[model samples]
Target chain A: ISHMSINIRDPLIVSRVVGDVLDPFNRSITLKVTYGQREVTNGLDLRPSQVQNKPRVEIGGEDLRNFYTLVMVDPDVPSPSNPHLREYLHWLVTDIPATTGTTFGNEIVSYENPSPTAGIHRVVFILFRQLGRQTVYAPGWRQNFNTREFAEIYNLGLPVAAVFYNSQRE
Target chain B: ISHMSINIRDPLIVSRVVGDVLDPFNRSITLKVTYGQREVTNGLDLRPSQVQNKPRVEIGGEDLRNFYTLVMVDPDVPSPSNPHLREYLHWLVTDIPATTGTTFGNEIVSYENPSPTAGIHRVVFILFRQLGRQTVYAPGWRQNFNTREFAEIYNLGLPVAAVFYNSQRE
Candidate 1:
């Protein structure tokens, strides 16, 4: 039996988006984002105002029976050169039933427009496969949120899918 | 059909290893490292001399018909806080025929003992699934070796497996 081959560019690796954030084993789903008709692609630049109200997101849920969690964060908070925030959670929605979309889920942290304090900010959307329906509490606050820890605490495991966009103070 | 539930701390995740470097969908094989008699687990710390020569590596390549590439780099070259080197290449061994270890394959950049100048250094071992039996050339110098670019140029695609160890000057 012959095994399939992996793409040379792999698209994800070229954009340095999902491939850079966290190594995802499966490119199972494509998480599409659009800011005012402008579909967001890796390294796609966007103005803070353009994403003021959160971009429209489309997730793949061939299996509606399965649930997922979505998180938007700025790993380069404050500045990319000095990412003290590491991953400052900008938006979080949990218990999001598949195929229902972000609007139908619990919005723990309302989408705060990415106003990059300095340098290029990488706004990443990470999707995790939920073992079962569960409640996720909003952090007391939203600065310095650690994605890894959150995954560990909730048994979110590794992300099933993810995408990223670049934005900065303009 | 209901999916079987697993614990949050999958041994692989708990090791704080490969997943930290690159995602492994299959949890395929464990990349074991050992300095002398010391077996290296994820984030395993050691002094310079202890791992000065090079740690023994055990990679599972059951299929001898396949090939692999191995790269050892210090993501935190000068220091973790200030990583200008971002990814400093310490060793590069390619065209490694399966079943044969690094010792049997060609070593592009000889294993240089880890001499971390400042702070803890993350020495990463990135593995790639080679498309075919291909020859790999040595880089002119080893200041900033791009792992992503190398993978792109060679069509190595996303890393099939990866592992890392931490070291510091004592």
Candidate 2:
């Protein structure tokens, strides 16, 4: 028919979030993150003052006991050209019950507002499925945090959902 | 584990094929295209002389009686910045049997090699399932061919498979 309104999840890949931040994976769950009344969309710009507080994260799954881990990081730090700190962790919460929000989870890493001092940065939120409750722990540091390594250490498999936004210094 | 190898069909989205040439849709079929022995991968650069001949397209489906329509077009003609002749058709075929190549299909428009005289052009191959044998026909002129309109006229729905490559003047 005319201009079929199809539902396909390719925004992350189109925005380079799949290749640059994480490898390709099937999107198996829905992730809704909103700061105040503004929602997080891939490649959309967000003003610094607008995201001063933590966003509400709602995960979608079938079972309530199925836990998850959420991580927020800024892949572009200092500058995109030379990101010595490739991924600067902004937030981390674990043991989040399925079909729930971050409020029902353990806040291992406190939420930090994006403070991009250089070029436009990609502020990303990655959600991973945890084997059980309290299976994941907090990282010692936020800077230079390796998402893949952390997942491996704690047996966190591939991410189930992810979303990102563009941010820069005000 | 380390850098998990995951299978995803987002290359077209990453290459801007989905948004630029076609709307987003669920890719439910597999399409393998090869120029001689060189396979076509999304966004890969191919020489003009390399794709002078027709490529072998192996459609993936179960029903042999089912037919398909294949269309090859160059979205970037003259230049990507100002494409006055946008979507110049390079080839069109109809009544291609399932799991068969273009050799078994009706050649409505003979294959034409991509002749990009200006900047790098995206040569795309879009595959559509036909309603029945000989349901689609050739266009009067190859220039300014509206792929979506053709699909709508012939009742061919959204593309079941699609792939593209970058090419420029030799």
Candidate 3:
């Protein structure tokens, strides 16, 4: 069997995601965040109108018994320059089956349409491996959500996979 | 592209490597710890004679500039049931280029022959992605080495890869 390494220069690192959203962590799992026919790349650009409906997210894992947690947020809330309302939670799902998609998990927070009124925004999808099934729950509020704290509270070690895209107002 | 999942139930978790050595973290990188032709699998049994010389360790990252740190330690020193000298450091190398192996990096601490006096011992190889080259150093001592604290001190977020084997006195 041949062993391989993760491409550390993947868009996630080049974009300074940790300074903006997450700290440096190994991308352990594969995450496919799709919008209909189009796919989400590290810093791909998309229009707000293109992602009105909740996009599909599929996880890659070896077993179905293992579970995962997925989150979508806009680090640039009101605007990228002055994001006083930074990290607006767009979607949050928990207890997703490994090797499955968002549909198979619990939607702790329903999907909110990508709404950016001012400048270019970063829309992020972060995936975490759950310690077990049903370990994560919804937050009381969506605005000013803290992804780091959420993971810490739930003991989510570090994101196994994460991807982001550029979005803006229509 | 097809996204795949990490087989979480790999021998690392099955053998309770975390409880005895590391905490729960995603296996982000692929590690192939080999001695001559034989490979190191989680909990694979090996005799002390088989690992007299340093084994070949090849990394699998996409870029050659990205560096990594590798550590080899025996968590069960003297004996597994009652042992004060837990986590005896066997080897440490730093600034290893991604997609390369132990030979290409700085050997801060040289490899020691696997020597277990009493019960079955666990010899672990833990890998961490470096933020940059020439960032890690040798420790003051080898005994009572704490993997978690070492990672935290060096800003090594989490182990990118890890594997272990069972070894005992000849």
Candidate 4:
């Protein structure tokens, strides 16, 4: 968000981010991901060590309302060249307080370090505005994760805020 | 582009990319930028020298048959918090052969390196589908750059493909 634009649609469209996964929805929330000390500017690169834990994500200022959920997935699972296990889930949290971040949120799927064996991986962080303080179950496996289905099952409407970080085996 | 999606629209809309600037349109072309060994991925980070000179851009694959135009702008001119020079034009080229890239095209505005003093700057690359081979003139200055206005004046229809990268003071 600078002089202002990301046309999130195209970036995702060219990469089949939409067709392969979630249907296009109007983004409403503002998501800021901070790893170590640096905030994630879109497509920013980070070392494995720098992002070995759950990043601090926020919606807006301290005075806020509404609840949200977060999902971290690696679309380029084994490799960008061959993503047979595309959309490998990395993390999931639900019932996140408006003002508070993941710290106070109910984490359904605990955080896990991203381990991309080959190629640069797109680590996408999707933030969804939840219908209410609802229950979310952790996926038994990380591979073959489906964000759209997950949203549908939980009745989590379209994503409000979403951002992605790039990483490679290091 | 991981998992084959680049939903170019939502990512920009929730962030006020449309209302602030640019009228929405259907995408028909795909744009790719390469600076030396680096392919400019969305949100990819590159140093100034890596993009000091004009980067090679291709459209419609190896056998591009149409003419196109490219505009490079930095919305986070000065700072993200204070974008006095929102959309500072970084480079421009018109009457570019479909697949030949900037080298074979007429350079309307020579490339300039980006030096973002504060906050991560959003460096945007916008590709426009031009009517035909036409003349282009350089703007009097880099400030007060209006991509929408420029496109309208030249009869360049909606953007076909657009992408962005991030940069900061090094």
lDDT of 1: 0.68
lDDT of 1 by residue, B101-126 (tens): 57656787999888998988878787
lDDT of 2 by residue, A1-170 (tens): 11243223567767767767776665555466888666676777898998989987766543445788899999887788788887899999998876566888999999999888999889999999888997899878888888878888999777877889998889
lDDT accuracy of residue B64 in candidate 3: 68
> Highest TM-score among the candidates is held by which one?
4
What does DockQ give for each predicted structure?
0.02, 0.01, 0.02, 0.02
Each prediction's Cα lDDT score? 0.68, 0.79, 0.80, 0.72
What digit string (tens of lDDT, one per residue) describes model 1 on residues A2-49? 115434354354434444455534656656777886665544446676
**Runs off by more than 4 Å, candidate 2:** A1-170, B1-9
A58: Cα error in model 3, Å: 1.0
Q: lDDT by residue for model 2 over B1-170, one digit each (tens)?
A: 11143222455654557777877666667788887655665654566777888888888764778899889999887677578888899999889899887888999899998877765578899999988897899989998888888889999888898977777564
How many residue pairs collide in each prediction? 0, 0, 5, 27
Model 2: which residue pairs collide? none
Q: Please compute the TM-score of chain B alone for each predicted structure, in the order given.
A: 0.81, 0.90, 0.91, 0.84
lDDT of 4 by residue, A2-34 (tens): 214545545554555555665665444446678
Q: Pick the lDDT winner.
A: 3
